[model samples]
Target chain A: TLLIRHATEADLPALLAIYNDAVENTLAIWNETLVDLENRHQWLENRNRDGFPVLVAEREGQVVGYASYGPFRPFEGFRHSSELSVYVASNARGGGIGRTLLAELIEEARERKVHVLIAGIEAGNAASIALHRSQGFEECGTLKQVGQKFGRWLDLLFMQKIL
Target chain B: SMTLLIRHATEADLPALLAIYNDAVENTLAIWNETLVDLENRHQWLENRNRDGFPVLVAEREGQVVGYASYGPFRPFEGFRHSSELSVYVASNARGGGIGRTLLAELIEEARERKVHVLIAGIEAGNAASIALHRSQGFEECGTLKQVGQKFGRWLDLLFMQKIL
Candidate 1:
């Protein structure tokens, strides 16, 4: 069984582990540096201070995935917009975790009066591209060679769902 | 002749820099940020750039400041060292008199002398006059970022043009 809840401070270490795993082993994050628990703690604090959402999926006894949205930029003109990010653990592959997390994220964003929800996926990440498309997001644009990882360049596919 | 003397900025030029910058912030899409900066704010900004060895040039005519131009680090972090972002601003009353064009040419020459690889201009897509000036100076249009910037409750497009120095 899985439980969806608002994440607490205790959940940050596991979240950082999951994120650093992606940074080290996947193309999800372009940076090659691995962040520590303090990074996740500060991130959680920032989201809470900004009145944003940071949700986690718990399966029996462990966190399997996390989702959240935050300011796309510091400018007040960007107040109505946010960029969403979701990460599912390796063990949760082929499961319904991403769909559940994204559905809840959409509702939370709409409730917050977010005018637009943007997702920037690695251009080659077919699963993420399909997931956002299935949820009514459309391709906004492509940034070519905007990121680098593992000694190779990567592109970003921006998709947006107007709420 | 407009008879403007383009000179290197000095300690007394901070106020003029702030005025031109505040004009861009308040009434133009030339800059994305909307805050009117103070003299000390611009002073520290220039001080930091001077610390980094970048050049700041000012244009004075009849003992009154009219324009300024400078280039700074294009992006943070070590990998972006070879590229720089250029900016030029003219006093509101000084436009259409070749002041901006002259200052831009001077900025490009300074960047080349410093061995800069790329000089990138992040221009508002709708600024035809500025774009034409850059085009005339051999800068090529690279790409346009759609809806990446917002000002006065409307989205703005940022156009990138680069000249290899």
Candidate 2:
């Protein structure tokens, strides 16, 4: 069983580990820099200050996955739209942690009256595609090879769900 | 002899713009998407850009619109407010007649008047003619994003060029 809970400041270290792993290994993120715990600490406090949700999924009393959403763009015109990102621990594969966390995020977005929920997934990520599809999201557009990582180019598949 | 004159776009010009844009969508590697648009949509777009203090220019000859060019926000973030992206379109039959060059030069003047720090062109990498034209007019090649767009069942490379105004 998986329990989803809001992330606290103490969760930054664990989250940083998962994030850096994704950055260095997977095509999930385009960034090449590996961020440290201090960076994540600031992120947690900023999200908490802005009332944005930072959530973690716990399986067997261990943090295995996390998800969150914030403003899609810095401008006021895109204020009604929020972009989400989700990451799962490598060892926690085949678990229901990601799904549970995403479902809860959708509920949070709906309660906040957000007009749109957007996800920019790597074009080749079938698992992420399937997850968003299961939640009634549709592909809006795909920008080819928008980012480079892991010695290869990565396409950005933008999917959105209307609230 | 063909006579070309520069003028403001009237409502009828939208059809020509739509036709030219559709041609780009269907034929050239310029625009990536395949969706065709109507005159009403283009007209509304022009109205909105004008309302936002952007200028739209047209080249006409014998009262027929031949080409158009405009510039808009390069990026949505406030940090990028000083930069703008330019788009110049010439009728297929009217191309290679210096029409694009004329429209682009005039558009650069407009951008300068707006105090635009950078006027960027996101051209297809394979467009040698456009690359040369921009370079001749003082635009510097910035960077190229390989296979960053798709059209006609193949990936397209995006070439970024910029002119400081």
Candidate 3:
């Protein structure tokens, strides 16, 4: 059984583990800096303060994954647009957790009246690309060498869904 | 005949910059914001740029500020530290005079020296001249976001262009 609920303070440690793991091992997050619990605590607080959603998936009371969205660009014209990120525990793949969390996150975004949901995936991330495409996102195009990590240039692939 | 001088901006140039900014805000689609801002707003903006060590270059002709260009972080995350989104605006009366091209050329050199890896331009798709300007400066069209903005009572398409430095 799985439960997708709004994230809270008690979920900070698990969130930190998943986030820092991605930072060190995966291209899903372009940032190479590993964050601490205090950072995740502040991130959640900031999301709540801004009225954005941070949701986590729990199986047997253990948090395994989460997804959220925040400002895509800092401009008045981009108020209706948001950028989303979904992360699943490395041990919890193919268990319907990512899709479930994403489905629920889409609803929460629509409830907040978000008009466009954007995903900036690493161009080489085929799994994330397929996931967004399965959820109705269309590929805009690719930006070549917009990011660098692990001493290599990275391409940013933009995918967006209109709600 | 006058020469176009590209130099760093100063507080004394804020009024002219403010006029140029607000004119784009009100009279054109170059800026997506519909609200007019005060000089204090631009003052704080320039202060933040200078504080961060980002360059704000002004185009001067005959001792008058005729255009301005600047670039800051494209996204707020650490991953985007080497990337920035840039904007360049020329005085309305000063359009079609090669001022924009000259300013952009200088800005590109500034980016290269600063170790900037990417420079982005988010332009309105309908603005053909601005798009052409970026293309002339080696920016490639990366993507398009349809109906991403609303101004002047209509939906606007955002064209994303980028140049890897």
Candidate 4:
């Protein structure tokens, strides 16, 4: 049984670990630099202050994944739209952790009345794409070479689900 | 027809650039912004490009600066460094002079020189002229993002176009 709930200060350490690991080891994120604990702390605070959510999946007394959504673009005209991201710990992949987090995230977005939620997944991340597709997100577009990491060019495929 | 001079924008070109930008912001869905920025804002905009080694080009026709073009980081992350989002604008009275097309062509050349791997433009779906201009320049349609913006009591669709350089 997995318990997914709101993240608190106690979850920062595990969250930071999963995040930085992705930054350094995987193309799951576009960042080339790693952030510290204080960064995640501030992020949690900001998400709370902005009325957004940070959900964590707990299994066997460990936090294995997290998901959240935030403003998609910085403009008044796009206020109703938001972008989402879900990250699962490397060791816990191919399980249902990401799926659970995403399912919950969609429900949360609906509760908040977000008009739309977008995911800009790296095109080579077929697993990520399939996960969103399974969750009813449609492929909107692909912008080629929009990202670069590990000396490789990455294409960004945009997917969206209207809430 | 008078000569068209396309060159690096100087501080004197701020008034023209600012006017064109604010006009789009206030009057058209071209910008999807409701805020009107001032001359100081344009100065900082130009200053940042100068400091960051990005090209800001201006088109001079009949001895007047009528349009400008530039590109900057598309996303805030380091992995997006190889790609940039480009902006092209021509003054209202200066429309249909092929000024936008000219500015974009030279902007792509500048992107190539800077080793940029991709150039992208996020245009409002209703902006047919701008879309045609990009298409003519070999920018392929990625797809449309539906109702991502709103203006004038109407929903606006954002269209993405990209050219791999």
Interface RMSD of each: 4.5, 12.4, 1.5, 0.9
DockQ of each: 0.17, 0.05, 0.65, 0.83
* Candidate order, lDDT descending: 3, 4, 1, 2
Residue-level lDDT of model 1, residues A1-163, one tens digit each, is 6687888998988899889888888987665778888888998999999899999999988999999998765556567778899989987877889988998999999988887887878989999999999999887655455455676656667787878
Report the C-alpha lDDT of model 2 over B73-150, residue by residue, as the tens digit.
Answer: 764533345667788888898888898888888888888888776777888889987897799789876555444355
Local accuracy of candidate 4 as per-residue lDDT tens digits, A76-108: 899889899998999998789999999999999
Every model's TM-score:
0.77, 0.55, 0.95, 0.97
**The TM-score obtained by chain A of candidate 3 when compared with the true chain A:** 0.97
Q: Write the per-residue lDDT of candidate 1 for residues B1-165, one digit (tens) a residue.
A: 459887778879988889889998798887777777788889899998788889999888889889999998764433345678889899998888888899999988988999777787878899988898899889887665456567767876657787776
RMSD value for candidate 1: 3.9
Per TM-score, what order, best first? 4, 3, 1, 2
Worst 10 residues of 4 chain A by lDDT: A71-80
lDDT, residue B75, candidate 4: 84
Q: Which of the CAPRI classes, incorrect, acceptable, medium or high, describes model 4?
A: high
Q: Which has the greatest DockQ?
A: 4
**Candidate no. 3 TM-score:** 0.95
Task: Please list the C-alpha lDDT of all candidates, in the order they appear.
Answer: 0.82, 0.78, 0.91, 0.91
> In angstroms, how far off is A13's CA in candidate 3?
1.8
Error of 4 at A9 (Å): 1.9
Q: For candidate 1 chain B, which ten residues in a row score worst on lDDT?
A: B73-82
Query: Candidate 2: where is the Cα deviation over 4 Å?
Result: B1-165
